[PDB]
Amino acid sequence: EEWRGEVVHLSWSPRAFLLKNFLSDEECDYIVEKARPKMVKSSVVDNESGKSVDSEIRTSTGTWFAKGEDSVISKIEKRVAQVTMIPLENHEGLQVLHYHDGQKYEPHYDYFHDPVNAGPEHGGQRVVTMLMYLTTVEEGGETVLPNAEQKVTGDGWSECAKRGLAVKPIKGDALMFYSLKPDGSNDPASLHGSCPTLKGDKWSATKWIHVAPIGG
Numbered sequence: 205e206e207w208r209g210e211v212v213h214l215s216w217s218p219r220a221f222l223l224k225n226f227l228s229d230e231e232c233d234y235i236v237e238k239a240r241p242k243m244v245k246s247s248v249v250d251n252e253s254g255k256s257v258d259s260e261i262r263t264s265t266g267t268w269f270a271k272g273e274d275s276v277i278s279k280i281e282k283r284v285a286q287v288t289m290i291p292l293e294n295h296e297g298l299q300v301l302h303y304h305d306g307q308k309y310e311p312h313y314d315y316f317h318d319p320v321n322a323g324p325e326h327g328g329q330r331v332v333t334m335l336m337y338l339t340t341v342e343e344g345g346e347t348v349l350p351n352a353e354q355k356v357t358g359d360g361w362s363e364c365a366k367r368g369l370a371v372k373p374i375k376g377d378a379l380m381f382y383s384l385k386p387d388g389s390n391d392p393a394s395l396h397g398s399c400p401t402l403k404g405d406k407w408s409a410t411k412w413i414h415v416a417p418i419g420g
């Protein structure tokens with residue numbers, strides 16, 4: 205339910221907020237261990253040939269959990285609803301990803317479902333995304349926002365990260381960022397990616413949250 209913790213304001217363009225210690229270590233491990241045997245390489249069906257091929261855009265492995273999948277996930281899902289102030293009926297289920305060994309997600313918008321996403325196709329417009337880091341990544345793996353106002357600088361950031369505002373994955377933290385402005389218009393500043401993971405293993409769980417109930 206209701207969560208009490210440190211929020212770091214990252215940006216107004218796009219609106220981005222870092223929720224410190226949003227998940228416990230135990231919850232992070234639970235999701236990773238539940239997801240692990242289910243992970244498959246990110247793939248899309250190539251239109252021309254009509255064949256399944258590895259995505260060149262999201263090169264992680266991936267899976268999904270249904271909203272309300274089980275009790276432990278359900279609890280987190282209610283917490284996500286509380287901090288975003290948007291009811292559960294508008295939330296997709298968890299998208300779990302694992303990147304390592306150079307794997308990335310090229311910058312894109314979360315405005316709509318993408319064929320690369322594991323799980324069902326949900327029509328509808330996302331307003332907000334929550335990205336929950338399930339592991340701490342030693343090198344690379346930053347979530348980068350290239351159209352943000354203030355780029356990150358200095359040693360300790362991957363070259364990819366220095367192309368925008370960037371967030372280092374730290375176990376238990378969650379990045380909340382808005383794809384739409386408060387008036388429902390698109391925010392082009394919400395372009396975001398996952399910089400290649402260079403050392404370690406990046407596990408993340410994404411919650412995509414719509415302006416209106418999913419389906420139903």
Ligand SMILES: O=C(O)c1ccnc(C(=O)O)c1
Nearest residue numbers: 309314347396397398408410
């Ligand atoms: O894992 C990430 O950092 C990331 C970056 C951009 N997009 C997503 C997503 O799942 O939408 C996840």
Ligand SMILES: [Zn+2]
Nearest residue numbers: 312313314396
């Ligand atoms: Zn995204």
Ligand SMILES: [Zn+2]
Nearest residue numbers: 304305404405
């Ligand atoms: Zn690995």
